[PDB]
Symmetry: C6
Subunit: 94 residues, 6 copies
């Protein structure tokens, strides 16, 4: 029994975000939560994933490595969230 | 009525880390995110609760956010002059 | 019997706009009309208030003074509008 | 049919001052605002009415707006080639 | 029997786009398809027209000439599209 | 299942030229446009179909777009790891 976790890769543009998502779901047993468009200078897209801490750490590292060859990665981060309400922290539209 | 706390960051990733850090105490409620945009790609995380709880939560959120991204604003309104529903903007989640 | 008036404080970001709103409703007997997000480089939020010319002049001066300690104030303005249709001039979504 | 007048400003505050100034004559009708964004945070105020009324209103709107903010564009289309509803964009208020 | 065509004039701001549209519909027997707001630094508005290749070439040249006296024209382009499904290529919201 | 192709441009005009060029072969399907914004005014054209068809279409789209505007990104995902519906964002047309 592990701890749940939230993983993010924030890129300039959608193309790099789709490559980060595909790379993330391919590298670990992580579930793709969804994309979040924030736009504003750079046109930022955030790819969010969930799963075991180790899986999410490996997936975000993989997704960022992939996305960097397509576009610019602005942020890469892992939140090891609790057991219950792992997506309570996310924004409503996902 | 209740105190209002805000952390405004450049990007969503830093805003989600600020939110997780802020809700980490049982007496602080996540009101929601508000996307503004501009050069930063500004996201505002709003919380409510007791003055002390909100002061500690926003200080925690900003501390966390900063290690992920850039914090543009951090503020606490201990006694909002109108009902927190009146003072806040229409779309908030 | 006075003249009705419209007051605005336009800031970079929402946090400074919420502080301007709270400061405005605290300083004078002015009603908070609402916020308007315009985004685009700076991420501009406009706080609109209504009431007596004097009240609105005092409130916008107060709101701008407050908002400047939280963020950047881009514009501060008072329109002394007519008796009838004081919000006819505003944009629909408020 | 009727003439079309536009004042495009950097920001909403300057656009509201332009609109108030433009509608200040009984023969000029406020079509609406259109938010565009970009580096300016562009807002377009559109009016309609008689050529003379619209020429005087847009010149008044731009004169006013300029003292509040930056005016990016001012223009009058005296005889729009299609119906004003056809020439304008779908969402206008 | 000619070939159908799609014409575009992309400007910084709406005012220049409305002048480009009015100029386009005045210069040739072209139908105004609609506007597309893309925003992001410059606040780009695209005016799309359809009709005969020659008509669309003359209209876009006219619309761009007009729009340049009101604002900044970012792009001017003509696509001579097929006979069937001339608007299949366009984005849904127009 | 099917390969996924993307061309991301600064502006819509270059994106429409990329799309027209990409669909110019019967075995390539236009998924849709996605507007992102930022300094570029980014528009992403997404296509699907056979690997070879998608490789040739995105190379064609980028070749075309570039003569109209600026191409920010060009990429092909030959074997998307989840269903193409899962990997793509919710609003796509």
């Amino acid at each position: 029994h592990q701890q749940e976790a939230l993983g993010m890769v924030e890129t300039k543009g959608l193309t790099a975000a789709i490559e980060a998502a595909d790379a993330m779901v391919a590298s670990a047993n992580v579930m793709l939560v969804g994309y979040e468009k924030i736009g504003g200078s750079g046109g930022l897209v955030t790819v969010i994933v969930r799963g075991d801490v180790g899986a999410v750490k490996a997936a975000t590292d993989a997704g960022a490595a992939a996305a960097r060859n397509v576009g610019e990665v602005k942020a890469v981060h892992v939140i090891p969230r609790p057991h219950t309400d792992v997506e309570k922290i996310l924004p409503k539209g996902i």
